[PDB]
Design a binder for this molecule. Structure first.
Ligand code: 1EM
Ligand code: 1EM
Ligand code: K
Ligand code: K
Ligand code: K
Lengths: 98, 219, 106, 98, 106
């Protein structure tokens, strides 16, 4: 169960980074002063957002850009909680055994 | 309906204090803030401070001398501004405005004209202005009303209880000997007067008076 | 505190012409600028919020643009009812502040 | 037990983001130069704070604003530790079973 | 290092009038400015901290305002005892620095 939930989350995270990159540019163009407006740097912004690093070099200023950002965040965080929970499950079993 | 209601005027003697009010209606939210803005005659808008009714906290402009104290009554949906120890520098129109916590002032009150002076209140005498007997008329005729000897400002003049607006000019008041005077002008088709009545309505908030003067041709 | 400079203080245009009012902020404020019209003896009225957003009830004639430190309020084809003083106001940093106002003359 | 603790934490987190947004504006207005002063962007700031992303576009400069920020942070972090611990518990059981 | 410019260096006011001293920082320092009064042959005395905060023992007459790069120390209704040199000082970045001082003349 756990590994499949984790693997799926990883696949789902990759999809969210790419879709999030596309949707962030769509949301932010048309807002004066917005910088999250070209796709290559938007993919970079989605990665530093999903990992929760959040340098501050780029960020959304619109309502829809910010909603996209929160989905990226939660997708990243969730994937990591799942990988962590999966590692714990693995270890717990190998330790029962040892 | 008017979202923010403020009294038209307050006369204050130098050194005395006065409490201005701003009654709010329409939608009210916990995120609302009521702001007060000062505007001296012929000058710009100066922010005085704000209060959030839902919590009762108030902040003030740090750049100016603090003359104001803000409070708010939740049940009467009224915001108050206590101005104290005033001087002539405090004479101005004070507006209240409502901000929904998003940075702009969606609506403004009509403002309260505060005059700081030792002079006494005096309602205006309203006299009719009708053409003389030798005055020839064109397709239009001009009438008016003379509003003199009042204090403090302002007066509001309307024609036919507000129904007659176009063709109206109310001149700025002139101050001579602790008293103001102004006149208002109205122009209507010559054929309609005196068949259709023309009356000027003069309101003087400071004295709580509102008088009417019908304009009839000179006998 | 943020200083908003409105210059020129008086703008004279011919009827039906396009006019633009300028508001410059002392530091970058994003798009957190709002514009008000105040006719003689009237109270201020909001025209445009957040630099370019329309307000219902306001003629389509009015529009706003800019971001950062330089903002513009434009009127396409001015008419008599546009005669009034116009003020900008920022909400980016506390305290809110107002520009000194521009008068439109026709 | 775990799911209810997690579900509750999620509900509690939503309440903290909204109350935190309101309280941050209350705390920060009156401090010259403060930018966390209007509610829509304060809700956005509470979300990027609770997820620990922390772009730096907005932040509190007052003592009470900062205390509010720490409560938002701990509420976000705690909710995620609870969801993670809940996923681990779920996985551990389904794996005993498998 | 942060340069604090106090200009004019001498301010002359009439008794009871409101006076304001200016301190401009070479870069933005938030509200990390403090003001001192130094009377002839006296040591400096703190008047206002963090741009606008009161200090107990100081007459209510004194107040401060501003944030960023421009700061003001104001005295409502000046009196003789206010005759002195006034200095601003920043604590935003190391090292702390002082403005060059403004003398109040009545
Ligand atoms: C009194 C209780 C207050 C509680 C908080 C309520 C905040 C207001 C509602 C939120 C947005 C309204 C949009 C608007 O008119 O603002 C937009 C204007 O362009 C930009 O929005 C923004 O840029 C802010 C985005 C915030 C995103 C939050 C995502 C949370 C999952
Ligand atoms: C020698 C041992 C030192 C240990 C550290 C002690 C620090 C001093 C006490 C903290 C605040 C005093 C307030 C003050 O006078 O400052 C306020 C002035 O506006 C602003 O506060 C601030 O803006 C700082 C906020 C810090 C919040 C920390 C929250 C931690 C859960
Ligand atoms: K981070
Ligand atoms: K960060
Ligand atoms: K950052």
């Amino acid at each position: 169960l756990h590994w499949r939930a984790a693997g799926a989350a990883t696949v789902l995270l990759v999809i969210v980074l790419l879709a999030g990159s596309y949707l962030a540019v769509l949301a932010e163009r048309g807002a004066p002063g917005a910088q999250l407006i070209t796709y290559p740097r938007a993919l970079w912004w989605a990665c530093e957002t999903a990992t929760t690093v959040x340098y501050g070099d780029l960020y959304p200023v619109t309502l829809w850009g910010r909603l996209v950002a929160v989905v990226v965040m939660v997708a990243g965080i969730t994937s990591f909680g799942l990988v962590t929970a999966a590692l714990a499950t693995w270890f717990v079993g190998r330790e029962q055994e040892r | 309906q008017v979202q923010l209601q403020q009294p038209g005027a307050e006369l204050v003697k130098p050194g005395a204090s006065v409490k201005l009010s701003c009654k709010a209606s329409g939608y009210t939210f916990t995120s609302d803030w009521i702001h007060w803005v000062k505007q001296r005659p012929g000058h710009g808008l100066e922010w005085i401070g704000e209060i959030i009714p839902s919590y009762g906290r108030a902040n003030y402009n740090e750049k100016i001398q603090k003359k104001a104290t803000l409070t708010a009554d939740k049940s009467s949906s009224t915001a108050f501004m206590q101005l104290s120890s005033l001087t002539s520098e405090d004479s101005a129109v004070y507006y209240c405005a409502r901000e929904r916590g998003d940075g702009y002032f969606a609506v403004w009150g009509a403002g309260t004209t505060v005059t700081v002076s030792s002079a006494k209140t005096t309602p205006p005498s309203v006299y009719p202005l009708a053409p003389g007997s030798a005055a020839q008329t064109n397709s239009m005729v001009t009438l008016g009303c003379l509003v003199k000897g009042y204090f403090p400002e302002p007066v509001t003049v309307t024609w036919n209880s507000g129904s007659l607006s176009s063709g109206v000019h109310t001149f700025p008041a002139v101050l001579q000997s602790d008293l103001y005077t102004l006149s208002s002008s109205v122009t209507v088709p010559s054929s309609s007067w005196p068949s259709e009545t023309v009356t000027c309505n003069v309101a003087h908030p400071a004295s709580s008076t509102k008088v009417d003067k019908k304009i009839v041709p000179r006998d | 505190d943020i200083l908003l400079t409105q210059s020129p203080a008086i703008l004279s245009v011919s009827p039906g012409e396009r006019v633009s009012f300028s508001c410059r902020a002392s530091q970058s404020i994003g798009t957190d600028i709002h514009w008000y019209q105040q006719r003689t003896n009237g109270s201020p009225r909001l025209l445009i919020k957040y630099a370019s957003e329309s307000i219902s009830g306001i003629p389509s004639r009015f529009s706003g643009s800019g971001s950062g430190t330089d903002f513009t309020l434009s009127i396409n084809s001015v008419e008599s009812e546009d005669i009034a003083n116009y003020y900008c106001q920022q909400s980016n940093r506390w305290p809110f502040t107002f520009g000194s106002g521009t008068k439109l003359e026709i």
